[PDB]
Design a protein around this ligand. Sequence first.
Ligand SMILES: Nc1ncnc2c1ncn2[C@@H]1O[C@H](COP(=O)(O)OP(=O)(O)OP(=O)(O)O)[C@@H](O)[C@H]1O
Ligand SMILES: Nc1ncnc2c1ncn2[C@@H]1O[C@H](COP(=O)(O)OP(=O)(O)O)[C@@H](O)[C@H]1O
Ligand SMILES: [Mg+2]
Ligand SMILES: [Mg+2]
Lengths: 470, 15, 39, 187, 487
Amino acid sequence: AATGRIVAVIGAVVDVQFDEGLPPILNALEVQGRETRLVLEVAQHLGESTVRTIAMDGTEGLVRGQKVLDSGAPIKIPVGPETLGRIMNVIGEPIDERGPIKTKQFAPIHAEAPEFMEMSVEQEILVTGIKVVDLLAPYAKGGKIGLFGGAGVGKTVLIMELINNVAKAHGGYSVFAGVGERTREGNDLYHEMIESGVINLKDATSKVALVYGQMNEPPGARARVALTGLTVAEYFRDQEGQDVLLFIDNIFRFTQAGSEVSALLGRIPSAVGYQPTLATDMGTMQERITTTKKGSITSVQAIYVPADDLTDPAPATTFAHLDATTVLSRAIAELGIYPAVDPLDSTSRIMDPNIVGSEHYDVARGVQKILQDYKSLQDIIAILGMDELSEEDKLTVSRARKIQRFLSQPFQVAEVFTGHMGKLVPLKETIKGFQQILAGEYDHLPEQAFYMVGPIEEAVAKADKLAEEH
Amino acid sequence: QKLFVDKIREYKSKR
Amino acid sequence: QNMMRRKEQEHMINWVEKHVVQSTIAKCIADLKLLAKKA
Amino acid sequence: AKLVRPPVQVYGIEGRYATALYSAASKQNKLEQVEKELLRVAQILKEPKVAASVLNPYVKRSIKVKSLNDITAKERFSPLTTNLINLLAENGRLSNTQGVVSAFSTMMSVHRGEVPCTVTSASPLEEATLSELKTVLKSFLSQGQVLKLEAKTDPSILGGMIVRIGEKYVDMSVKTKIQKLGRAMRE
Amino acid sequence: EMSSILEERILGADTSVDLEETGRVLSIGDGIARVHGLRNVQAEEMVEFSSGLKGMSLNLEPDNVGVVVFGNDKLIKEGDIVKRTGAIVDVPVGEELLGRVVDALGNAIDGKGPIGSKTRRRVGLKAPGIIPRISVREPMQTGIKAVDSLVPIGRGQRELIIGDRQTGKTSIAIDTIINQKRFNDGSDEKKKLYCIYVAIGQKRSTVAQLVKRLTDADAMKYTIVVSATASDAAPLQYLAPYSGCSMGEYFRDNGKHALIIYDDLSKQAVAYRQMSLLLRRPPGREAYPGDVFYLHSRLLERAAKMNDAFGGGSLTALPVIETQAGDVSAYIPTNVISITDGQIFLETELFYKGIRPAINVGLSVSRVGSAAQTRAMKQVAGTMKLELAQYREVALLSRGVRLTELLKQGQYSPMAIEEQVAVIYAGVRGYLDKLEPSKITKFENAFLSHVVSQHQALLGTIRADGKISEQSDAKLKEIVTNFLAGF
Ligand SMILES: Nc1ncnc2c1ncn2[C@@H]1O[C@H](COP(=O)(O)OP(=O)(O)OP(=O)(O)O)[C@@H](O)[C@H]1O
Ligand SMILES: Nc1ncnc2c1ncn2[C@@H]1O[C@H](COP(=O)(O)OP(=O)(O)O)[C@@H](O)[C@H]1O
Ligand SMILES: [Mg+2]
Ligand SMILES: [Mg+2]
């Protein structure tokens, strides 16, 4: 096809001048004369038969005038069941040293979002075994979830506990896309999925496909790897009808990489410093991760929050794309409460009495009401002390602290930190325990009897142990 | 090799 | 003794290239021919 | 529409206009003709009177290019060249046309295959060894190439010579060799 | 000496001349040189200016090349010649650097002559992928009781040392470097740790005194020091961490174990912000460029632990971050917390209250942690961490006070793992619950001297086995009870 010449190299932004046969936007171009395959994705047409492109790998060693070849199609990755148990990078090459991925078809990573007449409405609660999640913000089968959190508050531990519970109990070809995360964590996940039998290195019956572009990758790879994993999941949903799980961690890195290349594309910076096209990029990417009438994609996404802002344009823009947000807090994690989910900031769309039932709904609303009352009291509690509160106020503070402690839970993936064995509290135990703590059936137990327990039976047992030993 | 026969004249001078 | 040695060495070096300061393009033509051979 | 890229690329408004002129002439095979043309128009403008008539920012563009139309219809100029000057007065880029002329010159001097070489010496060079090193210089280029050798002199390089073949560069100076020897003697 | 000049400095002197490719400086300013020419120069290739300076070809543009100047742009004028080197920016690596102080480009600044390096390695290489790595298992001993017990560090890890100014971060790194002497002198060559200390934006006098502290402890013989101090150009303070990281990747790739300290990364982010703002790039939060996260993450990602098919080496990174007023929710602190595998929070309240090292045990964490402890240290430190959590909950109480005073340590005093285990054992079994607190340190001192002067056999058994067996358990029990009766 068409051949052109590099005319400018600035970071990950390469300008390529074609003499004839200009390539459409979003096409893939192969730089000629390199040891490893370097792919440039067309982003703009500058005129003068020049295009501007974003490089999917490093641009060092590139010389002005180097040959570039046009592929005639966007980045195409192999899609199919043969991707299960394999690791592939942003451009579909296997990075697990197990040979080529011999699939029958390749899909472009740029596609159109499903139409409005394909949207599905069904809303069925997805039980995760986590107390605060299943009580205050239940997830939904086939709904986008999203886990917001600052730096080091429990995003990856929570996403791995969700992986364990849901993905292991599942039967529908999970997919994991590591976007701008630690390569160490990717190796850990690969090997803990090899040992658990979810990835089968021989006699291939795997049920998870991994796609990884990590912190070490240039901005173009970190900006398109989410689309690559998204494409794998879209294949599993549409052309098989399967019920896919899709885990994305971390998806703020997509916006951040767009912001890193936006300056070099010559665009006036928006607010904060992000690209002017933040919301529409997030929309074109996030509207493809969706359940249709053809298949179901349960999408859990970790979302980094820069400097613990939550009003930074990237988290603020992500909020509108999710059905059940779970917001972790640093102030809570400094109290020792894990998972550090903020009870008064995590929402859900199925938190509706006509879906979860009046029992669940009323218990959740009461828990949130008592926690809100405690928060509003906290200021004069810490100024004057509790000795000045009303007796009803002392009761609301007591029950609120107890509910705080009961919301925490030891995680199976956190035995290395908690020392306790991981508990998986089913839904009715959660509802009943919290209903009882609300009613006042435990006004005599010490508050530390609820910290890091399973169901309320373990709380009463821990209280008995504390009372007898001490 | 003109500059070696440059240098060691100066080196002998310094000697 | 070693510090005096080093300092004498330093004055000797700046004096020797002062000697060159006070002080025939046959080598120039020879290098030209060599580069011409370098094609 | 397809465009003929010259063998050298000049940049700026000068580079763009001259690239346009080159790719226009190459599709009609009138390159040296239009060089003599822009040579002529450059000497047209370099005389002070209508140089001031055209660099005046208080003329109306219609007035300035009206005088330009007049003087360009005087010297039976090619439609290509009249059109170029009409465009430079349209876009108001007229005062920079010398540069464009400049550009075009350079461009076609790599069309004829000339390579500019510059030999700096510490002494005003002899004639013999001047053309001696000219013959030496000849052997670096492919056939079809012509040396534009311009040897200036700078008596600070302390002897030897510094020859620049385009951007290739040999520094046989003696000052730099003395610096290298001093560095080796210190390190 | 006279013939130390005509040695070969004249005969072998590179007095060659070659057909070089050149460019001409168009405009120098703001530490960036717009250079005309260099048609075949590569992106991120090192070029050399007329003054002997060096630079990196950052912006390949159609009509010019933007060159980042590694040094003072005072020595560059418009019209200067700029030669290609044909080599993407790289630094000398090898074992010939151990004991040498160098600047960000690999040049010796200790006056001991040139580094006899035979290998060069690029500063901007890519970190290893997913397959070359393997989980952290081997302990990286710091010699500090608090760190080695509660916040263990394995080989191949990234552990942030974060805290305000003058809270003992450099002291922790220097003790970690001094502690590796007991391993580097031993026989097992799979426990030797070669240390690297990159000093960025620091006072040069402080770096000289650091090299002195390392030479007195005879730790320089296995330590590289890369110095890009406060007066050096911002590009040099930008490059220094990647130079040090390549010097450490040399060991990581050849089956050896390196440790690297970046002191600190906040100053490298400040230098990169200077360069970015002088390049007219859009400033984000706190005027930092959009890719300061990438700046630190492509660097701290090269600290890996290879598997036994890729050599089995490692590279541990201890990046340092200085917070303002104890704010950890700032931009760059949270960036590096997002990159690393844990933190060591040093506090000003603890440091001012005589608790040194002022490690906040409740906030310090090590995501890898347990997988890289010895068995004996694990045995005693599990109970110690449980009791410390109990004590901070109620802030038993006397046990907690006893333990926190047992965690104090002196500067330049890294303890072997056996002696830390002995002290923590004597603290965690209760054997000073009734000794009033202020004598504890004294007791500790005396106690350990006892255990090292007379019971060397028990410590040797703990060293050989790695665990404190039931036999050694009762042995240490009678030792500590007999001493306490004597004390
Ligand atoms: N473990 C310790 N025990 C007692 N004193 C200590 C200890 N560590 C440091 N100090 C003292 O407190 C001072 C703090 O110096 P240090 O360099 O270690 O802190 P820093 O975080 O690096 O501060 P800076 O930003 O200035 O470099 C030390 O000079 C030392 O005098
Ligand atoms: N469910 C939990 N129980 C106990 N500790 C936890 C839990 N989740 C997180 N943590 C602690 O918080 C730290 C940060 O965890 P992680 O999720 O990996 O950080 P990040 O926010 O960058 O994803 C962990 O190292 C762990 O010590
Ligand atoms: Mg994460
Ligand atoms: Mg310091």
